[PDB]
Design a protein around this motif. Structure first.
Motif, PDB file in Angstrom:
ATOM      1  N   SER A   8       0.812  -1.209   0.000  1.00 53.29           N
ATOM      2  CA  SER A   8       0.000   0.000   0.000  1.00 53.29           C
ATOM      3  C   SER A   8       0.849   1.263   0.000  1.00 53.29           C
ATOM      4  N   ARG A  26      -3.636   0.467  -1.171  1.00 56.48           N
ATOM      5  CA  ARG A  26      -3.970   1.427  -0.108  1.00 56.48           C
ATOM      6  C   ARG A  26      -5.481   1.400   0.124  1.00 56.48           C
ATOM      7  N   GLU A  27      -6.214   1.495  -0.976  1.00 57.31           N
ATOM      8  CA  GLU A  27      -7.665   1.499  -0.957  1.00 57.31           C
ATOM      9  C   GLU A  27      -8.199   0.153  -0.479  1.00 57.31           C
ATOM     10  N   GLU A  81      -7.539  -0.066   3.145  1.00 57.46           N
ATOM     11  CA  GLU A  81      -8.408   0.918   3.778  1.00 57.46           C
ATOM     12  C   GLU A  81      -9.834   0.383   3.880  1.00 57.46           C
ATOM     13  N   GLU A 138     -10.119  -2.100   6.748  1.00 55.47           N
ATOM     14  CA  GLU A 138     -10.096  -1.411   8.030  1.00 55.47           C
ATOM     15  C   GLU A 138     -11.498  -0.896   8.312  1.00 55.47           C
ATOM     16  N   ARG A 139     -12.175  -0.459   7.259  1.00 61.49           N
ATOM     17  CA  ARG A 139     -13.525   0.054   7.413  1.00 61.49           C
ATOM     18  C   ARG A 139     -14.515  -1.067   7.737  1.00 61.49           C
TER      19      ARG A 139
END
Lengths: 127, 127, 124, 124
Positions: B93, B100-101, B104, B107-108
């Motif tokens: 990432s 990265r997305e 991310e 994580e969400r």
């Protein structure tokens, strides 16, 4: 405790795919499982029981007379033990902040699941 | 592309749960499957195969000399193949907008999961 | 209620990242918001109050003596009030089947989320 | 790569909620963003545009002739750019494991979420 209108939304959503006979079949199962007698529904001993219990139940759902409201209100227990948890949750999120947060969390989760599918798709096209 | 320090970060994270030997055995097996010759690793020949490979690999990761860097870069292919997908996503990432997305979004999804717990307990208040 | 040992599991886990000072600070705030008086904890009307009772709290968590044990149960309310929901569920899971099922479902969601990353990794 | 019959399933699924006007309105927009010219789609400087594009599009979806099939194929790029991602993943899962493993992981994620709801309700 739970506005008849909102009991209607969940009831129509529960019957949206497979028709009204499924929610009626389920509600009636629970009803007799719970040993209820009000409102009155027909048992398997009656010729076209399901079809008849289906028309009775949804008639009350659609009507709005004090009578209708009283019968569905008495049926809530059979409904709540039968209806898809998610729908039950949506039905109560109008009169409860708890259930409202439960539905909001689940929906936030479904969006993120779909944002994942999206990012995963684009990016695969980027070979 | 992938910086030596990003590899270190994911390498130590991998090693943290059960020690550096798991990552080492894992990277070796992958190493000998892709029939790699550089950097040099130890065959299941040597009595102290694992232990000696463990020392060698993390000694390169821990250092910042051009030689340690070079050898970890050559080892990247074997690392990417045996390293837990999440750690790989994380490791990449810093160099890729996609990963990265991707990271991310997980994580969400995980925060949502914990929000569910928060609500389910925020309910013990009422019983 | 909740076995002293289990509180120690969540209390240490809660201190692992940022340290001891965070849990201690959270608990103290919840303590005073609840208007509690037992156990004895130092308010801001003290010098390094936070450093002084961060010592007391964890000095109680590490022991298994009747006095350590009783003072923690007394603190639970401030602990359940400030501790992160997830650690709380873990904590009560050892005694509640409901909370154990709750924690299991959370793990599956997390695992499913990791399966997503792997699949996208597999597509590399 | 993608069989006409599978494009039809996703197209109809995308249509069921609010009718065929949604897909067409959406596919049409992507069509012009990508600057496409085949098949022919009416641009806004046309009176009954949307209504006309809708009949055109689902007329090819319904059929299985070479003409209908090649026209939907030519449209694929605009379809993929605008169709809900989960629908696009379902659509191309019949021919790819990657997209099938994606759909399946998403379904579990929603089942376990619904699982949490059921559990949390039973609780309070």
């Amino acid at each position: 405790k739970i506005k008849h209108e909102h009991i209607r939304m969940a009831m129509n959503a529960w019957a949206h795919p497979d028709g009204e006979k499924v929610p009626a079949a389920e509600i009636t199962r629970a009803y007799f499982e719970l040993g209820m007698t009000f409102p009155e529904l027909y048992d398997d001993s009656h010729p076209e029981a399901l079809a008849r219990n289906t028309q009775k139940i949804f008639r009350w759902v659609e009507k709005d007379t004090p009578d209708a409201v009283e019968k569905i209100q008495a049926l809530l227990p059979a409904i709540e033990k039968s209806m898809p948890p998610l729908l039950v949750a949506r039905m109560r999120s109008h009169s409860s902040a708890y259930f409202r947060e439960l539905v909001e969390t689940r929906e936030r989760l479904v969006r993120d699941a779909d944002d994942f599918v999206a990012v995963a798709i684009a990016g695969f096209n980027q070979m």
